[PDB]
């Protein structure tokens, strides 16, 4: 089974809608035998360059261990939702559980 690191950032005007999207996406993963390793909320964060005429983007970092059922639907509902402006997934080497350098300083 694959090991994914899922990066998605939220539109800053809907920053209170973030914990709703945390637990709605999680219940579809864990029901189909999908594990979870890291769930870190960062709040607003300053951008290196502006994107979609905005500033101070909300950042949420994830690690999802799950089969290929979630990789079809979750990337489409990111493109279906207007809240997520950037979605990025990547395959990792192992199931990892380690705090980010953003949390270790903040």
């Amino acid at each position: 089974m694959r090991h994914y690191e899922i990066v998605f950032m939220v539109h800053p005007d809907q920053s209170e809608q973030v914990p709703g999207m945390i637990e709605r996406y999680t219940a579809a993963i864990t029901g189909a035998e999908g594990k979870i390793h890291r769930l870190e909320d960062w709040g607003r964060r300053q951008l290196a360059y502006p994107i979609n005429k905005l500033h101070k983007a909300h950042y949420v970092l994830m690690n999802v261990e799950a089969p290929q059922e979630v990789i079809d639907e979750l990337e489409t509902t990111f493109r279906f939702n207007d809240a997520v402006i950037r979605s990025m997934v990547m395959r990792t080497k192992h199931a990892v559980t380690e705090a980010s350098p953003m949390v270790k300083a903040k």
Partner: protein, 55 residues
Amino acid sequence: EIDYKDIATLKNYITESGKIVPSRITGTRAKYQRQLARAIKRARYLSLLPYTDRH
């Protein structure tokens, strides 16, 4: 082993104009140099490092 999240390592490996310093100047290993290149290209999409000194 190397990762894109530790931006303090990535600040030591770029210029003021966002250009990637090659391994000739820093004297790093060639195994990490391909890995540091794609790690910046991950961070370049995630708006962590600027492309140029223009914006």
